[PDB]
Amino acid sequence: DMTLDALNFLLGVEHLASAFYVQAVNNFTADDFKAAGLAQRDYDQFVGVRNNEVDHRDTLISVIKSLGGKPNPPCKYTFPVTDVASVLKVSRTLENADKPAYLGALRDIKSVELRTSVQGALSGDSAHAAFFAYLTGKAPAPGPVDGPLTQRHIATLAQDFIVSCPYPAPKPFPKLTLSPQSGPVGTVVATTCAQDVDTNGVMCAIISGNQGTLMQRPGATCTIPPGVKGILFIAWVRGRDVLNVGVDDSSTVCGPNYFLLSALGDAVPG
Amino acid sequence: DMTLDALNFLLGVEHLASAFYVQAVNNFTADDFKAAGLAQRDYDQFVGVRNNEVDHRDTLISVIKSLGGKPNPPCKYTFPVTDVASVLKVSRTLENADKPAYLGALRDIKSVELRTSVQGALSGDSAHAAFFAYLTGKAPAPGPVDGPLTQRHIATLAQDFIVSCPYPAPKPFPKLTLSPQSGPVGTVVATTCAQDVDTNGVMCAIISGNQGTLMQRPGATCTIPPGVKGILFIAWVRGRDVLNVGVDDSSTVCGPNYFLLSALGDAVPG
Ligand SMILES: [Mg+2]
Ligand SMILES: [Mg+2]
Ligand SMILES: [Zn+2]
Ligand SMILES: [Zn+2]
């Protein structure tokens, strides 16, 4: 049923993340982290993230089996890892994307006890995201409310890390490149779609956790509007038949991709 | 109904926290934080926490009104604030307690859209907790899964900050003092109840997010068992008629209080 499908979707998310962290711990040591300016405790927490994500994955496998389901296996991955900076970038990207993934999946999970367990893992990924934000100079808590995205939206965020999957996984939309990918309200973002999408009738969809989706004609640019807070997900949608894009992808034509809106807590002088 | 009651309970939690942060920002400046060894970005994030918690409170008020409810007003508070260290201690305490509060309340909230909003705020408080953990030398993500506590358990955690409430709020259990209040597996914790509770038949209840409640006869001491991860909540319960104490307080006789289990990511040399 939809509960099982939601859990298997989260297992796909956690297969990818756990695979990344397991491999990264094997390829990077505390000395590598210290050479990059980090502390022993930061490497230790990184190992803790690995351990926590192995648990998040293994818990989903167990629960799916207990419900009579068939747990998804891992896909084949590719991670753009060179130096410690790139490890932190991939980590931040994965953990930021966890929140909308879990929030979307929780809409479909039917029992109280199951929701409690899954919410309790979301809380953990949220703590991981705050850690990686802080280590990369971004506010660990850039806004009050994280919002959902759909399974296909999450596949779109993850697509550059997936070589192939041995089952029919949620299909991504074309990637939307954002330049720049961070900045304050009023930033004019140049948006480029990986596929030749006709922008006639397209709206920029700025998907926020606190204000929902804000939609505006592109300039192809999208402008960061006032009032939104937290991480933003920017997509192209065709028309406005869908007003709440975070819960309905039926008008999405490119993206979303993440945009790191400036916030109190970002690194600043002094 | 129970949804309204759960939201009003969370509004009590967020009245207390927002009141603390609003007052603390008025009494402490970035220069105070810098004199304590912190950075401008840490003060900025602290202001962001205030802003986020004002939003968490105000959102609950609005939602309760929209459901035809009567939002709880603030209680009268007392916060043990002297220096910056004490600000961070109170902050960490409040944010750590948010997670079980929201997780318990979510068991009672009936609609998909409401749960999405409330889960999205929990995600934010989880990020706040990770920030304050990191600033105080504790792992920002000490375990994989955060677990629930009941409304009365949350009142017990909060009781030292409440002078009075102008409505019948959830009643605390007697405070359980833990010495020490942090340490690794195997730590023997001396536990003292604020009221003269007879320990004949009492069990130590070690309430973990990953393994549930573990119960053992006291020594009055409780020993941290293997296998638990994350923040622990330690209570005295009478008998074992309740096995899952995080969702049923009907056997609780003292506590819980929090215990900061050592974890990868805690401050360590190098
Ligand atoms: Mg994660
Ligand atoms: Mg909070
Ligand atoms: Zn996870
Ligand atoms: Zn809050």
Numbering used by the authors:
A (entry chain A), B (entry chain A): 18 to 236, 245 to 295
Quote the study's own text:
We determined an atomic (1.05 Å) resolution crystal structure of a Ferritin‐like protein from R. varieornatus.
Here, we focused on the tardigrade Ramazzottius varieornatus, one of the toughest animals on Earth. A transcriptome database of R. varieornatus shows that genes encoding a Ferritin‐like protein are upregulated during desiccation or ultraviolet radiation. Our results indicate that through cleaning up damaged metabolites or regulation of metabolite levels, this phosphatase family can contribute to stress tolerances.
